[PDB]
Structures are given as structure tokens and as C-alpha cells.
Amino acid sequence: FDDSITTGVNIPIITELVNDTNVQFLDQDDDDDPDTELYLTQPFACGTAFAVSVLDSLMSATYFNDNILTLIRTLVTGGATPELEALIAEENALRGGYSTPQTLANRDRCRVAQLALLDGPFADLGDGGCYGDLFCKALKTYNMLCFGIYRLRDAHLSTPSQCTKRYVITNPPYEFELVPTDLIFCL
Amino acid sequence: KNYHPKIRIITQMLQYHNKAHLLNIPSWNWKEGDDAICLAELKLGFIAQSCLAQGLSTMLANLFSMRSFIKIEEDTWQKYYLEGVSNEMYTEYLSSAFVGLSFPTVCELCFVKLKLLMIAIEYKSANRESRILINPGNHLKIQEGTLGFFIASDAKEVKRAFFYCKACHD
Amino acid sequence: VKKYDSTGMFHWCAPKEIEKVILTRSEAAMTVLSGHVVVCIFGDVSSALIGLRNLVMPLRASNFHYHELKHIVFVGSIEYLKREWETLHNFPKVSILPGTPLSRADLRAVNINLCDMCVILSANQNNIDDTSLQDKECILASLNIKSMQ
């Protein structure tokens, strides 16, 4: 790509896979024999390969706690109230309303996005501060939940390269020193 | 459901448009546990969240699997990862001490004190219409009888939210 | 001018070409349908003819008056019903609605709460895979209509 590779390999893509052994072929940095199961591989840990077969463990997880499939359904479909799912079932696709000021309260439940520790009022904590200071001050000031760090693979000093592959860590402790290259899963 | 119309069943579907037929069965009560799992709604939903924040297709898909917590030592990108693959969503009722508190005060009191991340509540607008609320602001206060959606590594530690009081646990 | 099919035993009309009787979801809403018959055809372009000549003909007998004959609405795929229409085009008061008989929009557009009968026919391939899983499209359509409000 022009400069006016720009990213080239660093275009962020995501790929569904029919199988699970085919996760080896997505990256050229794998160390994966064909019994290293699917959660340990790099294209799944970085978040660029979503096989369908990781949802086979959901019905074992739904049986033990009923409110587990209803927490990921909302979070994920966004809306999906059964009062709306019925209306899509009635005739067709969606139907429009005329924006009464109680349906405008259905807006602004939660946005889901990630943001960087390179600027803003968090970079003073996002350079050397503990993660437990970062979580408490986001709810205190801006009221969003910091529930995960999108850690770059070579943030540990390992001959600094252009590998922009970032992996996912879920709910780090009150400890766990940050790096300014991190991205934070917020709400 | 003809043979025993009280049994809980859990169904995988393949399309979304024809999980509406399961509403038509009169024994099917999803408030009792009869929840059908669509696969074209969740696959294309986890991908649609990764277009907003990349990694949510594997942020979420580790939160409902009993992952084999092995401990790697020498590596650095796999040691930080496998400490985050043993975290799972658990539910537990909030104690009576949280009643009247706003949501951002509660998650602070859960993460600082209990060391538990609390992602959502179950607000009892009605017993037949109870919405589920991820991260509300200051508009809400905790009712007695709201269910607490946590994230933790142990089923033991999630019980300590039901035992939070201002007498000895605090 | 005169339409009583020279034997003098059923009813008759001019040979209608197929486009005159097609409706859509908005067109059949303006058509007041009451005391009618909704036939639900689960078909295909390739599935065998069930021969809807034999269904319409006892409902067009000369033993009823032309102000009494029940209006018939087929709800099914037109790729099936293009094949059928050569055997029907001399019968009066027959409409065809394209669309599958599982969308409730098509069953509300024909006002199924007012019909005298909702015939559901499996016009599809029979003995496809199993014995009991054959009429699964006919059970779900009957559970569909009994759950509407």
C-alpha cells in the first residue's frame, strides 16, 4: 500500500473457520503441532480466528447456570429484548417509530469499545500505574468498566519489532503493572 | 414436551428466523429454563462485537469454558494469557448491605474489597418483565433482589458477595 | 357470457392467465376475504404435482350459487403453482398469493381468522429421509396458526 505496506500484515481481520486444525495456517509464526488445542494457538488468542466449535461449550455452561446465555445474548446482540424478537418474528424485518421520549431512553444503555493509554486523562496512569488504580478511577469519573487489557505480544522487551499482534487478557488484578502500548476493554 | 411438559430443554438452532417456532409450543417457558441457543446469532454476534473492540470473540469465548489451568513459566505472552483464561461468569444474589447503593459504588466495593469484577445486574422492573442491565450509571440503585453477574476464577469467591455486611465482613 | 360448463355439473369462466390472480401482502389486505378457504401449499419447482384440480372441483359444483362459492386462496411458491395453473384456469374465484405459509405476514394478509378452513397440504417430496420426519413442515404450520393472536 501507498504511504500517502502501510499496515499490510497489520490490517486487522477476523476469520471464521469450519474446522479447528486450520487455525495453524492463518499465521506464519505458529509453533503448533496438530494436537495443541484451539484456545492455546496464537490466531485464537489474538482474536483473529473465531471457529464455531468454541460455542459447543456454551450449552454445557448454560445448563449449570441459566443466566449465562442471557448475559452473553444481550451484551452481544446489543438489544434483543423478547418484545423486539417477537416483532421481527411477526411479519418481516424491523419497523419504525416516531421517537417518543421513552424510546429515546432505550438509547444509551452501554456502548462497547476499546480505547488507548496514549493520551487522555488516563495516560498518567497508563504509563506506570497499577491496573487497580485505572479501574477505580474510570467508574469514579467517567463511569465505564475496565474489564480487560488488549496486550501487545512484544510489550515484554524481546528485541523490539513491528509485530502488532495483540493478545487478550481477561480481568487482571489490582496489581499487574501496565505498559503504554496497551488497549483497555471498556464499556 | 408432550411426554413430560415440565422438563427443561436446551436446543441448538442453526438459523435465527426459525427459533420463533419454539415460542409457538405452549409448554415452552423460557422463564423456567427452556433456552434455545442460536448459532447464527452468536457466531455473527461475537464477530460483530470484534468489529467494535477486537478480541471480544475470544474475550467472551473464554468466559464459558472450563479451561485446563496449566501453568507455563518461562514464556511471557502465554503466561499472562493463561492467567486470563481461568475466569468465568458466575451469578450470586447481592447481600442486603448493598441496597440503596448506586451501581458504580458497588463495583468499587466488589473489586477493591472482594476482588471481584461485577459486570451486570438483574433489575426487577417486574417479576415477569425483569431486564438485564450491563453497567448502568448513577440512575439506578440496588434493590433487594437484584442478581449480580460476576467474573471470577473460583466458585468460592463469588459467594462472598452474598455475605457482605458492615459488621464483620467489611 | 354464459358459464356453466356444457355437462352442466360444475362452474366455468374465461381462461384466466396467471397474472390476473396473483396478490401481494398489500393487495390482499384491501381484498375483503371472509368465509373463504386458505390452502397452504409447501411446494417447489421440482416437487411432484398433487393435482389441485381435484381440490377446487368439488368446491365449484353446480349445486351452489355463484354468490355462495367460497373464495380459494393458495398460499405457496409460485414456482410450484405455475405448473398447476393449466389445470385450474377455468374455475371462478381463485386467487394465488406467493410466499411461504410460515410467515405470519402472509397468513394475516389473507385474514385467516375469518376463513372457513385452512387446508395444509404437503406437496413436497415424500419419503425423503425418514418416516416420522416427513411432515415436519405441516406440523410447524399448524402449530404456527394455533399460536397466533
mmCIF file of C-alpha atoms in Angstrom, chain B:
data_model
loop_
_atom_site.group_PDB
_atom_site.id
_atom_site.type_symbol
_atom_site.label_atom_id
_atom_site.label_comp_id
_atom_site.label_asym_id
_atom_site.label_seq_id
_atom_site.Cartn_x
_atom_site.Cartn_y
_atom_site.Cartn_z
ATOM 1 C CA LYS B 1 -42.754 -31.753 25.781
ATOM 2 C CA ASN B 2 -45.742 -33.997 25.053
ATOM 3 C CA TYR B 3 -44.199 -36.722 27.181
ATOM 4 C CA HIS B 4 -43.433 -34.503 30.184
ATOM 5 C CA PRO B 5 -44.385 -30.816 29.910
ATOM 6 C CA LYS B 6 -42.245 -29.605 32.809
ATOM 7 C CA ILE B 7 -38.794 -30.653 31.636
ATOM 8 C CA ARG B 8 -36.071 -28.112 30.947
ATOM 9 C CA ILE B 9 -34.641 -28.437 27.461
ATOM 10 C CA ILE B 10 -31.715 -26.717 25.766
ATOM 11 C CA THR B 11 -31.598 -26.660 21.986
ATOM 12 C CA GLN B 12 -29.054 -25.706 19.386
ATOM 13 C CA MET B 13 -30.563 -23.940 16.401
ATOM 14 C CA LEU B 14 -28.871 -23.230 13.107
ATOM 15 C CA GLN B 15 -30.767 -20.187 11.848
ATOM 16 C CA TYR B 16 -32.248 -17.263 13.707
ATOM 17 C CA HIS B 17 -35.503 -16.831 11.797
ATOM 18 C CA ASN B 18 -36.811 -20.247 12.851
ATOM 19 C CA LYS B 19 -36.216 -20.171 16.549
ATOM 20 C CA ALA B 20 -39.509 -18.294 16.630
ATOM 21 C CA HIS B 21 -41.293 -21.611 16.146
ATOM 22 C CA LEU B 22 -40.241 -22.617 19.648
ATOM 23 C CA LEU B 23 -42.391 -19.833 21.043
ATOM 24 C CA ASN B 24 -45.438 -21.494 19.484
ATOM 25 C CA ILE B 25 -45.212 -24.584 21.704
ATOM 26 C CA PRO B 26 -47.389 -23.965 24.787
ATOM 27 C CA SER B 27 -45.199 -25.920 27.190
ATOM 28 C CA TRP B 28 -42.111 -23.887 26.182
ATOM 29 C CA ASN B 29 -41.477 -21.449 29.022
ATOM 30 C CA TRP B 30 -38.113 -19.733 28.681
ATOM 31 C CA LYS B 31 -38.552 -18.207 32.122
ATOM 32 C CA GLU B 32 -38.225 -21.733 33.544
ATOM 33 C CA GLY B 33 -35.010 -22.695 31.761
ATOM 34 C CA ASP B 34 -36.104 -23.556 28.227
ATOM 35 C CA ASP B 35 -33.462 -21.527 26.392
ATOM 36 C CA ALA B 36 -32.624 -22.301 22.774
ATOM 37 C CA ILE B 37 -29.113 -21.481 21.615
ATOM 38 C CA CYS B 38 -28.964 -19.945 18.183
ATOM 39 C CA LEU B 39 -25.677 -20.439 16.407
ATOM 40 C CA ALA B 40 -26.046 -17.894 13.634
ATOM 41 C CA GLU B 41 -26.957 -15.256 16.221
ATOM 42 C CA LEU B 42 -23.964 -15.848 18.474
ATOM 43 C CA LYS B 43 -21.305 -16.554 15.847
ATOM 44 C CA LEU B 44 -22.226 -13.459 13.867
ATOM 45 C CA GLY B 45 -22.631 -11.557 17.098
ATOM 46 C CA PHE B 46 -19.204 -12.330 18.521
ATOM 47 C CA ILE B 47 -17.721 -11.292 15.189
ATOM 48 C CA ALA B 48 -19.847 -8.139 15.166
ATOM 49 C CA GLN B 49 -18.501 -7.183 18.583
ATOM 50 C CA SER B 50 -14.931 -7.696 17.403
ATOM 51 C CA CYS B 51 -15.547 -5.032 14.768
ATOM 52 C CA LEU B 52 -16.052 -2.678 17.735
ATOM 53 C CA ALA B 53 -13.337 -3.928 20.088
ATOM 54 C CA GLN B 54 -11.095 -6.609 18.624
ATOM 55 C CA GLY B 55 -10.692 -9.573 20.941
ATOM 56 C CA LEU B 56 -14.279 -9.904 22.166
ATOM 57 C CA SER B 57 -14.635 -13.052 20.100
ATOM 58 C CA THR B 58 -12.090 -14.580 22.478
ATOM 59 C CA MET B 59 -12.743 -12.331 25.464
ATOM 60 C CA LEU B 60 -16.165 -13.926 25.747
ATOM 61 C CA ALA B 61 -15.362 -17.413 24.469
ATOM 62 C CA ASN B 62 -13.060 -17.994 27.444
ATOM 63 C CA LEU B 63 -15.750 -16.934 29.925
ATOM 64 C CA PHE B 64 -17.878 -20.034 29.472
ATOM 65 C CA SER B 65 -15.372 -22.848 29.152
ATOM 66 C CA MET B 66 -13.760 -24.909 31.916
ATOM 67 C CA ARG B 67 -10.236 -24.329 30.690
ATOM 68 C CA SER B 68 -7.395 -26.570 31.855
ATOM 69 C CA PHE B 69 -5.404 -24.214 34.078
ATOM 70 C CA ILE B 70 -1.885 -25.323 33.340
ATOM 71 C CA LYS B 71 0.960 -23.070 34.470
ATOM 72 C CA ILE B 72 3.596 -22.005 31.978
ATOM 73 C CA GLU B 73 6.637 -20.317 33.493
ATOM 74 C CA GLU B 74 9.360 -19.323 31.042
ATOM 75 C CA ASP B 75 7.184 -17.769 28.325
ATOM 76 C CA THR B 76 5.813 -14.238 28.524
ATOM 77 C CA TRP B 77 2.856 -13.863 26.165
ATOM 78 C CA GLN B 78 1.430 -17.222 27.200
ATOM 79 C CA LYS B 79 1.950 -16.706 30.932
ATOM 80 C CA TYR B 80 -0.091 -13.508 31.004
ATOM 81 C CA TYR B 81 -2.718 -15.146 28.799
ATOM 82 C CA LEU B 82 -3.308 -18.348 30.761
ATOM 83 C CA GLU B 83 -3.890 -16.341 33.922
ATOM 84 C CA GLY B 84 -6.731 -14.744 31.986
ATOM 85 C CA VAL B 85 -8.176 -17.954 30.580
ATOM 86 C CA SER B 86 -9.304 -19.114 34.036
ATOM 87 C CA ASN B 87 -12.016 -16.527 34.607
ATOM 88 C CA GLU B 88 -15.698 -17.437 34.342
ATOM 89 C CA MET B 89 -19.058 -15.714 34.691
ATOM 90 C CA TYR B 90 -20.839 -16.583 37.923
ATOM 91 C CA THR B 91 -24.106 -15.364 39.401
ATOM 92 C CA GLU B 92 -24.862 -14.734 43.060
ATOM 93 C CA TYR B 93 -27.506 -12.661 44.791
ATOM 94 C CA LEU B 94 -26.410 -9.356 46.268
ATOM 95 C CA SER B 95 -26.496 -9.069 50.041
ATOM 96 C CA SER B 96 -28.773 -6.715 51.954
ATOM 97 C CA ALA B 97 -25.908 -4.290 52.626
ATOM 98 C CA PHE B 98 -25.777 -3.162 49.001
ATOM 99 C CA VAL B 99 -29.408 -1.989 48.992
ATOM 100 C CA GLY B 100 -29.699 1.707 48.237
ATOM 101 C CA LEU B 101 -26.192 1.965 46.814
ATOM 102 C CA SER B 102 -25.652 3.054 43.233
ATOM 103 C CA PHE B 103 -24.048 0.728 40.693
ATOM 104 C CA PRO B 104 -20.575 2.420 40.448
ATOM 105 C CA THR B 105 -20.204 2.353 44.223
ATOM 106 C CA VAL B 106 -20.991 -1.369 44.239
ATOM 107 C CA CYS B 107 -18.420 -2.417 41.623
ATOM 108 C CA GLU B 108 -15.792 -0.444 43.507
ATOM 109 C CA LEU B 109 -16.746 -2.218 46.743
ATOM 110 C CA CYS B 110 -16.623 -5.550 44.918
ATOM 111 C CA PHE B 111 -13.287 -5.053 43.196
ATOM 112 C CA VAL B 112 -11.392 -3.248 45.959
ATOM 113 C CA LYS B 113 -12.686 -5.369 48.848
ATOM 114 C CA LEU B 114 -13.999 -8.655 47.455
ATOM 115 C CA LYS B 115 -11.581 -8.663 44.461
ATOM 116 C CA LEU B 116 -14.477 -9.496 42.153
ATOM 117 C CA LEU B 117 -15.391 -7.824 38.889
ATOM 118 C CA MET B 118 -19.134 -7.223 38.619
ATOM 119 C CA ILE B 119 -20.336 -6.705 35.080
ATOM 120 C CA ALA B 120 -24.135 -6.546 35.237
ATOM 121 C CA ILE B 121 -27.255 -6.667 37.396
ATOM 122 C CA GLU B 122 -30.765 -8.061 37.038
ATOM 123 C CA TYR B 123 -33.171 -5.206 37.704
ATOM 124 C CA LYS B 124 -36.619 -6.300 38.905
ATOM 125 C CA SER B 125 -38.863 -3.944 36.989
ATOM 126 C CA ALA B 126 -41.353 -6.818 37.081
ATOM 127 C CA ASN B 127 -41.166 -10.460 38.075
ATOM 128 C CA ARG B 128 -42.356 -11.333 34.553
ATOM 129 C CA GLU B 129 -40.501 -8.399 32.933
ATOM 130 C CA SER B 130 -37.047 -8.291 34.534
ATOM 131 C CA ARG B 131 -34.477 -6.650 32.299
ATOM 132 C CA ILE B 132 -30.766 -7.378 32.467
ATOM 133 C CA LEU B 133 -28.578 -4.296 32.708
ATOM 134 C CA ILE B 134 -24.896 -4.208 31.831
ATOM 135 C CA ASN B 135 -23.060 -1.319 33.590
ATOM 136 C CA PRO B 136 -25.717 1.289 34.475
ATOM 137 C CA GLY B 137 -24.668 4.732 35.579
ATOM 138 C CA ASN B 138 -25.865 6.701 38.594
ATOM 139 C CA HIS B 139 -29.514 6.401 37.568
ATOM 140 C CA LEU B 140 -30.006 3.110 39.394
ATOM 141 C CA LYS B 141 -29.856 1.982 42.996
ATOM 142 C CA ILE B 142 -29.545 -1.622 44.137
ATOM 143 C CA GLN B 143 -32.866 -3.218 45.011
ATOM 144 C CA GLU B 144 -33.167 -6.117 47.411
ATOM 145 C CA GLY B 145 -33.404 -8.984 44.956
ATOM 146 C CA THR B 146 -31.123 -7.995 42.087
ATOM 147 C CA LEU B 147 -28.820 -10.708 40.781
ATOM 148 C CA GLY B 148 -25.117 -9.960 40.499
ATOM 149 C CA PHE B 149 -23.225 -11.039 37.383
ATOM 150 C CA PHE B 150 -19.597 -11.544 38.379
ATOM 151 C CA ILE B 151 -16.340 -12.653 36.776
ATOM 152 C CA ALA B 152 -14.032 -14.785 38.891
ATOM 153 C CA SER B 153 -11.674 -17.737 38.870
ATOM 154 C CA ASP B 154 -13.295 -19.646 41.747
ATOM 155 C CA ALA B 155 -16.864 -20.515 42.648
ATOM 156 C CA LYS B 156 -15.870 -19.970 46.281
ATOM 157 C CA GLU B 157 -15.001 -16.281 45.976
ATOM 158 C CA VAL B 158 -18.239 -15.359 44.211
ATOM 159 C CA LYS B 159 -20.252 -16.433 47.266
ATOM 160 C CA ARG B 160 -18.619 -13.683 49.339
ATOM 161 C CA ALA B 161 -20.895 -11.077 47.747
ATOM 162 C CA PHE B 162 -23.923 -12.634 49.440
ATOM 163 C CA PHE B 163 -22.059 -12.376 52.762
ATOM 164 C CA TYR B 164 -21.088 -8.703 52.519
ATOM 165 C CA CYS B 165 -22.243 -6.745 55.558
ATOM 166 C CA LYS B 166 -20.989 -3.768 57.558
ATOM 167 C CA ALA B 167 -20.413 -5.780 60.765
ATOM 168 C CA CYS B 168 -17.635 -8.368 60.341
ATOM 169 C CA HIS B 169 -17.084 -8.993 56.611
ATOM 170 C CA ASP B 170 -16.289 -5.318 55.866
#
